[PDB]
Design an enzyme around this catalytic site. Sequence first.
Site, mmCIF file in Angstrom:
data_model
loop_
_atom_site.group_PDB
_atom_site.id
_atom_site.type_symbol
_atom_site.label_atom_id
_atom_site.label_comp_id
_atom_site.label_asym_id
_atom_site.label_seq_id
_atom_site.Cartn_x
_atom_site.Cartn_y
_atom_site.Cartn_z
ATOM 1 N N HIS A 16 0.820 -1.204 0.000
ATOM 2 C CA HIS A 16 0.000 0.000 0.000
ATOM 3 C C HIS A 16 0.862 1.266 0.000
ATOM 4 O O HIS A 16 0.555 2.258 -0.679
ATOM 5 C CB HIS A 16 -0.934 0.033 1.233
ATOM 6 C CG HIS A 16 -1.927 -1.080 1.293
ATOM 7 N ND1 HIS A 16 -2.377 -1.598 2.485
ATOM 8 C CD2 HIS A 16 -2.568 -1.768 0.319
ATOM 9 C CE1 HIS A 16 -3.261 -2.548 2.245
ATOM 10 N NE2 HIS A 16 -3.401 -2.670 0.939
ATOM 11 N N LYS A 40 -16.231 -7.321 4.731
ATOM 12 C CA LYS A 40 -15.124 -7.670 5.616
ATOM 13 C C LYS A 40 -15.473 -7.368 7.083
ATOM 14 O O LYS A 40 -16.150 -6.372 7.377
ATOM 15 C CB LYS A 40 -13.870 -6.868 5.193
ATOM 16 C CG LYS A 40 -13.325 -7.266 3.841
ATOM 17 C CD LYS A 40 -12.213 -6.300 3.374
ATOM 18 C CE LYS A 40 -11.436 -6.813 2.160
ATOM 19 N NZ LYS A 40 -10.439 -5.761 1.593
ATOM 20 N N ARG A 89 -2.756 -6.259 -8.198
ATOM 21 C CA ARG A 89 -1.811 -7.309 -7.960
ATOM 22 C C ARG A 89 -2.176 -8.563 -8.744
ATOM 23 O O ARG A 89 -3.301 -8.705 -9.205
ATOM 24 C CB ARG A 89 -1.829 -7.716 -6.507
ATOM 25 C CG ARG A 89 -1.787 -6.632 -5.534
ATOM 26 C CD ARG A 89 -2.511 -7.069 -4.380
ATOM 27 N NE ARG A 89 -2.570 -6.100 -3.336
ATOM 28 C CZ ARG A 89 -3.466 -6.165 -2.351
ATOM 29 N NH1 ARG A 89 -4.380 -7.151 -2.318
ATOM 30 N NH2 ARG A 89 -3.455 -5.238 -1.400
ATOM 31 N N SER A 127 -3.342 -7.641 3.087
ATOM 32 C CA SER A 127 -3.551 -7.456 4.523
ATOM 33 C C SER A 127 -4.014 -8.755 5.184
ATOM 34 O O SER A 127 -3.637 -9.110 6.284
ATOM 35 C CB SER A 127 -4.625 -6.383 4.724
ATOM 36 O OG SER A 127 -4.209 -5.120 4.204
#
Lengths: 158, 157, 158, 157, 158, 157
Positions: A16, A40, A89, A127
């Site tokens: 990040h 989440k 990514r 993360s």
Amino acid sequence: MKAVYPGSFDPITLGHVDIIKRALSIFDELVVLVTENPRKKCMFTLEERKKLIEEVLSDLDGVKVDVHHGLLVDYLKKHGIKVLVRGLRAVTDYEYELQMALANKKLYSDLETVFLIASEKFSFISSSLVKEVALYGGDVTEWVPPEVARALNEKLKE
Amino acid sequence: MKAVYPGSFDPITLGHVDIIKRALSIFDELVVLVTENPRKKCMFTLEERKKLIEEVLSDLDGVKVDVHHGLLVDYLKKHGIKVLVRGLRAVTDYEYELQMALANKKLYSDLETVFLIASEKFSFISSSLVKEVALYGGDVTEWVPPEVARALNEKLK
Amino acid sequence: MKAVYPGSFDPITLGHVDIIKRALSIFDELVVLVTENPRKKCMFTLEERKKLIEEVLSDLDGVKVDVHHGLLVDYLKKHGIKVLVRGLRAVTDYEYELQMALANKKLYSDLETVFLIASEKFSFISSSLVKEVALYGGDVTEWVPPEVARALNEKLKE
Amino acid sequence: MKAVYPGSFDPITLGHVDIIKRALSIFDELVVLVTENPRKKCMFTLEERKKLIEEVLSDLDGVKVDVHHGLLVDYLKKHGIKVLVRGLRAVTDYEYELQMALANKKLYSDLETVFLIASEKFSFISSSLVKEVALYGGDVTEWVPPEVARALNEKLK
Amino acid sequence: MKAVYPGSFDPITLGHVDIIKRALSIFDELVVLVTENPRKKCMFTLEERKKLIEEVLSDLDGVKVDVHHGLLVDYLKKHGIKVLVRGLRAVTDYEYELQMALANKKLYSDLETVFLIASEKFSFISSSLVKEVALYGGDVTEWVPPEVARALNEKLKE
Amino acid sequence: MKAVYPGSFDPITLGHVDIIKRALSIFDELVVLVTENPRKKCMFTLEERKKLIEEVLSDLDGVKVDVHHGLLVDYLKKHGIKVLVRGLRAVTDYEYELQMALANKKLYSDLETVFLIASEKFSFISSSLVKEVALYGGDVTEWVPPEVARALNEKLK
Ligand SMILES: CC(C)(COP(=O)(O)O)[C@H](O)C(=O)NCCC(=O)NCCS
Ligand SMILES: CC(C)(COP(=O)(O)O)[C@H](O)C(=O)NCCC(=O)NCCS
Ligand SMILES: CC(C)(COP(=O)(O)O)[C@H](O)C(=O)NCCC(=O)NCCS
Ligand SMILES: CC(C)(COP(=O)(O)O)[C@H](O)C(=O)NCCC(=O)NCCS
Ligand SMILES: CC(C)(COP(=O)(O)O)[C@H](O)C(=O)NCCC(=O)NCCS
Ligand SMILES: CC(C)(COP(=O)(O)O)[C@H](O)C(=O)NCCC(=O)NCCS
């Protein structure tokens, strides 16, 4: 020109931070926006995440950190920001990113979501990976700033 | 020929309505089947969802709306139905659809799952998107029938 | 109801034969259409392919075999056919199928492309794989009808 | 700030024109770069493609059109440009784009490749689709500028 | 235990060398097999490729370099080898690898194709990328052994 | 040479058994390791799963079954094992397997994760599929060992 980099940042990783630094080479002002992802259950509160990011970014010019609980495009509309930055990514859910970009544009027609590519070294971290590894006591030092490693370590005791 | 279009329809969106209409050009009888997805927590009950769909489809000929709580292929076996229709979007989990089509065929060998392609305009929407946006007070009017926009608005109060 | 099952069929495999058999359970009349793919150099002429398929489907009811050199939708419009059948395999280029379906529907608005899922056993084969293996003298007997194994063998002597 | 929008543009479509107009909302100067793709056999020469694009973008401020025969990053280095813009479609080879972005960044460390999302309408079109349809005499008018429909028409005679 | 690492190796990159080194930690004998891929036009002949590989691996124990012009499983059957090693990259065509593994296991039932993961740094490189870059005079030094950079340079003058 | 085959095995299916048998042709010793997946809520406890697997593999030489609650690489480091085996299916999340292989190798630099390909017949099944179908009372006989069918049936009552 202003851009928002929105994310759960739960916690912020070195991937990040790389996107932030790189985004600043294109946008003079960057808002790092800790925003609620309703799909989440987060480890850190929005404010815990904001403070961490502020510690981590503390000597970058051009960056501000903020939080938002509602619809992302309402944050941007309110502040007259028309650019969203996101990272891509190898492990990115590409259709999810596209869906959200297209949905956001439908809700805010002046919006442009701009994507940067993660470097190879950060293209397979997340993360989620970080938290999973830290929670079993693995070393995440190469994936997160030291501030975040400490924060993770504490949360794993608390 | 009879086909079932099974789904959560939680809620039904314009993308779904489009697949229904198009499926009817091939199959003269279509059952829109509100079915339990055990990997989802649903916003609307099965019966709330049936009723919306009925309101929404209410002058389409050839369509019946039903609900089912169990194993999908059991509904199709009991009613002698051998065709399942599903929609394919850009955002569809393709391996999931394949997995399920193949598993269903294992369970019910006469079955064919037939896929139609969502039009471009509906290829990146989903009920999940619609609910998330509605829940934060965004306009979902372009993605759902007005009956559904109304229903979502009520549910959010 | 009439449907067309279009493809290169270069050569036809057991996977194609399965989709034909299965499609015939839904559509009373099926046209197997040997169609030119401008992105491939085919091994067999359109007519050689038609003849093999006819041998192979010889005692299925409801199936006709034909060839077409032009725009696929033009064949359908000419013959009043509004359904196209295609198979989906694990090794299918999903985006290409989706692209072609959507393009074909833009060119012929009444069209519906319908997809069937290849069975597990045929979900990782292709005419390409067959040709490459036969070319090096491998056994392709589990992937193609005997007529096709024969025809491949001959072609790899020529 | 300057960016290059590199591509085959063989031919340019309405999807590419959309990306160009949108990129000009961010970048004050945009170079549309007709660049050789060694994994493609082109329909039009690099110079035909340049002329077409110049016709098409004729009254857009802030855009220049150019051609390049060699390594992409060499054109950027030469002109002091450090941003590349590309478009992302549903039909994009994502891993190809990532490879190429990462390779270009290795070759030219100051580079940033920036991606915009194609609108739903243009997310399933490509130059390759256009050419294939045109070559069989299909109507490609809703996918290309009229200039390009004309040029394709001629080339197919 | 013996394994074959088959490939075009046209040319061999550092990514391939990494897989070789790592595969040797599992298989005590490794055959690096330069094999003809009929879907590629190769830049170097099979013998040029063998020679380069031998230069590059010259002081690795346990590795033998060979060439094969026919069906891959025929080489393995002939030499009693039952394991094939391949690498997996972010840019790998996963369905093509699966197809080929499954096809190969169909043609040689005792075979096992075993996959290793490319490291992050080599996960987005390929011989193809290397050749494209070199052809336009770009530096491919970080992606190939010096022997290969030299060979590529020469070939680009020839 | 020793390898670990780690997984939730919740429950073990015939696809897993096939990977075990085949991995044994390469690795003389295999540890089947029932390991906690923190992104899943399991149906069976780790010990229920260990016992199932032991019943199922009872007459295979070279295989040991174990459980582990922590970081997977710690199990391997502790036991001097440097090979992990995993299966690849059509329905496998490839990026997830890559991510984890790479992360594991970062945490344990001697490690190699080695992938076998699921046979076609097992390439579209999963423990999740099995559970979902068993839950609705469908026949999972073709996908799991009879010991597991039984265990699932009990669990559903
Ligand atoms: C946090 C995020 C930006 C996604 O980022 P993440 O991938 O880092 O979790 C989030 O999903 C978001 O946008 N939330 C606000 C809700 C919203 O505006 N839109 C969702 C409909 S597009
Ligand atoms: C509702 C649905 C059809 C999925 O539709 P959805 O994608 O609209 O959620 C569902 O998953 C289903 O089939 N549910 C319960 C019955 C069943 O047979 N499940 C196992 C499928 S192999
Ligand atoms: C032969 C085929 C059906 C593709 O099938 P294939 O995958 O078996 O090769 C072909 O590509 C096709 O549809 N049409 C040939 C010309 C055409 O219509 N092209 C444009 C399609 S949008
Ligand atoms: C390949 C392409 C022409 C553009 O791609 P497009 O065909 O997808 O529009 C690209 O712009 C390009 O860079 N061509 C020149 C050669 C080069 O720089 N190659 C190495 C790319 S890593
Ligand atoms: C060399 C290779 C393994 C491919 O390697 P590459 O992917 O590195 O080009 C090749 O395509 C091959 O196997 N060639 C001989 C043909 C053959 O035996 N089999 C393909 C049928 S499954
Ligand atoms: C999480 C899991 C059990 C996944 O196996 P599964 O795909 O069968 O669920 C995996 O085998 C594993 O590594 N688990 C333990 C937690 C751990 O070590 N996590 C870090 C993953 S890098």
